[PDB]
Design a protein around this ligand. Structure first.
Ligand SMILES: COc1cc([C@@H](CC(=O)O)c2ccc(C)c(CN3C[C@@H](C)Oc4ccccc4S3(=O)=O)c2)cc2nnn(C)c12
Ligand SMILES: [Cl-]
Length: 288
């Protein structure tokens, strides 16, 4: 029912949790994160919203986060969960069969290839097989109970490469690379395709959008977004992609755009209450 945006960055890391309602255009401000964080990811398991990793960039210092925190819309409260094995800033996450996969990200100058999986029933993290590539600012999506890690930055180069994790083999394999180098792209799934929207290539923030068809193993460009943006939040709500904020090399954007795959068009839907980048985004039910 609602698109939740958690944390992000403008001047410093943010604690905001706000929920947008596509049905009426309204934004609600909800309970702040306990710790400000940018470069985190959001996901939903069993109706609960999780905020994963990131970094607190504050005037008092810069601290990468290994934190997992859970928001209950029914109570409007955040609860701490078990922390990850390592801090993971500029993280990507995916959910498969009620488990959260935390992928890549940085801890200071360490750019992680490691991956770990959270089991809400046990409140436990366990490492799984590492990716073949170190990736921070990595886009993650899940399609047909397979996990995809797309683009990012390896410590030296921004990447067009992507790879797939096969849970029952505990194994990563490269897939077809994207046609575009993208770090901090928005990555999501819609129908049978993984979409990669925007990002940064070391020179420019991008408006281009391409999608990987798992059946054909090829990437194809769709219509570009109205705004160039890196470190955007992205989610799917009722068969449409929504992209939230990000950075265009000039402004921390408040723009929210929506993609209709049937007309292959992007349109402006709303503005966030303030411009920000590096948010975590996910969809769950209305609070209380
Ligand atoms: C080094 O410059 C950049 C890096 C990244 C990547 C990382 C890389 O490729 O080296 C990236 C990917 C994901 C995330 C979340 C971030 C960090 N966030 C975006 C940046 C532009 O804004 C800031 C600034 C300060 C603190 C935190 C953030 S962020 O919103 O979390 C970067 C994206 C950029 N877009 N414009 N510039 C100048 C960028
Ligand atoms: Cl950062």
């Amino acid at each position: 029912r609602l698109i939740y945006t958690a944390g992000g960055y403008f001047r410093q890391s943010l604690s905001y949790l706000e929920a947008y309602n596509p049905s009426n255009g309204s934004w609600l401000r909800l309970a702040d994160l306990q710790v400000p964080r940018s470069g985190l990811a959001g996901c939903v398991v069993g109706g609960l919203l999780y905020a994963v990793g990131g970094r607190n960039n504050s005037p008092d210092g810069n601290t990468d986060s290994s934190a997992l925190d859970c928001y209950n819309p029914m109570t409007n409260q955040w609860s701490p969960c078990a922390s990850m094995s390592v801090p993971r800033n500029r993280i990507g996450v995916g959910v498969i069969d009620g488990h959260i996969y935390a992928v890549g990200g940085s801890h200071g100058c360490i750019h992680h290839s490691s991956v770990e999986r959270y089991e809400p029933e046990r409140d436990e993290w366990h490492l799984v097989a590492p990716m073949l590539t170190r990736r921070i600012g990595v886009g993650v999506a899940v399609l047909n109970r397979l996990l995809y890690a797309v683009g990012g930055f390896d410590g030296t180069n921004r990447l067009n490469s992507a790879e797939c994790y096969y849970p029952e083999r505990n194994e990563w394999r490269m897939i077809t690379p994207m046609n575009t180098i993208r770090s901090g792209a928005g990555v999501c799934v819609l129908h049978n395709c993984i979409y990669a929207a925007g990002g940064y290539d070391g020179q420019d923030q991008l408006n281009s959008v391409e999608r990987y068809d798992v059946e054909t193993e090829t990437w194809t460009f769709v219509a570009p977004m109205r705004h160039h943006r890196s470190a955007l939040g992205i989610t799917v709500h009722q068969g449409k992609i929504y992209v939230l904020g990000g950075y265009d090399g000039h402004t921390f954007l408040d723009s929210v755009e929506c993609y209709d795959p049937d007309s292959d068009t992007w349109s402006e839907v709303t503005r966030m209450t303030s411009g920000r980048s590096g948010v975590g985004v996910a969809v769950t039910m209305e609070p209380c």
